């Protein structure tokens, strides 16, 4: 197990392998954090989150 096969490449959501390296991305309504791994909800009621 390497890159995306290794614990999802440490990505919160989508993991892609480009040129032998991990590229994380997020669902609509999320922004990729500065660390390029975490996904931050842009506004209230982000998709896929149970409410309160």
């Amino acid at each position: 197990r390497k890159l995306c096969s290794l614990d999802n490449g440490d990505c919160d959501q989508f993991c892609h392998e480009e040129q032998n390296s991990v590229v994380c991305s997020c669902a609509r309504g999320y922004t990729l954090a500065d660390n390029g791994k975490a996904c931050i909800p842009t506004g209230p009621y982000p998709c896929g989150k149970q409410t309160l």
């Binding site: 995306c4 999802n8 919160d12 959501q13 989508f14 993991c15 892609h16 991305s25 669902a27 609509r28 309504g29 996904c39 209230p44 009621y45 982000p46 998709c47 896929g48 989150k49 149970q50 409410t51 309160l52």
Partner: protein
């Protein structure tokens, strides 16, 4: 849903309920965005005219979080066939936008490759709905949810009396008495990854409910992600 548990406050906020002219629930749906609902194409033949209710966990009480939406456009997959339930998918565009709140929020649409390699390879998914709690009973007045193991594709084909196409997948139990059931059709099959729930299936059909040697059959959402994307843009 046969077996499983009640959805507790805020646990299944993407659940949608299709209700007929007489305000009775007959199929489920999944909230994709403020304007769009994902459901099964076969549900569209279950009523002449219908509306969509969201935020409802108990169909017997009027809390204040529940909202009824009229459907503006019905987008049914053109290859849906009654014979096999292949291409069992439809997208509904609502007349007015859904207000997100406690118990009302969309599920995430995943990217195809990642969903196939990461979501569908998880042990389990979660199915939900207001369907029957036993094969012969009446619709549940309470929203229920059930963890369903992903079933090996070879196993599923062997267990089935009918063809399992590449647009379908199987989930559930061999003998354990838990499954989706009548009225759960069109509802969500979601998969949790790091506390985020992604739409992975649509409740489609089964040979009865929770029968020995049989599994629940779901529309494989990953095969229709581009289709869904196109449907939500026009």
């Amino acid at each position: 849903i046969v077996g499983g548990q009640e959805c507790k406050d805020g646990e299944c906020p993407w659940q949608a309920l299709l209700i007929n002219e007489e305000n009775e629930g007959f199929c489920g749906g999944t909230i994709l965005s403020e304007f769009y609902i994902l459901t099964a194409a076969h549900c569209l033949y279950q009523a002449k005219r219908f509306k969509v209710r969201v935020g409802d966990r108990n169909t017997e009480q009027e809390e204040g979080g529940e909202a009824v939406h009229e459907v503006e456009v019905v987008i049914k997959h053109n290859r849906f066939t009654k014979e096999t339930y292949d291409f069992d998918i439809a997208v509904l565009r609502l007349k007015t936008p859904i207000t997100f709140r406690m118990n009302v929020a969309p599920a995430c649409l995943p990217e195809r490759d990642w969903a196939e390699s990461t979501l569908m390879t998880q042990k389990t998914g979660i199915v939900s709905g207001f369907g029957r709690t036993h094969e012969k009973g009446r619709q549940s007045t309470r929203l229920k949810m059930l963890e369903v193991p992903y079933v090996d594709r070879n196993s599923c084909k062997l267990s089935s009396s009918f063809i399992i196409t590449q647009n379908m997948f199987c989930a559930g139990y061999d003998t354990k008495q838990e499954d989706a059931c009548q009225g759960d059709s069109g509802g969500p099959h979601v998969t949790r990854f790091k506390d985020t729930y992604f739409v992975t299936g649509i409740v489609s059909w089964g040979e009865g409910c929770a029968r020995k040697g049989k599994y629940g059959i779901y529309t494989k959402v990953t095969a229709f992600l581009k289709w869904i994307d196109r449907s939500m843009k026009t």
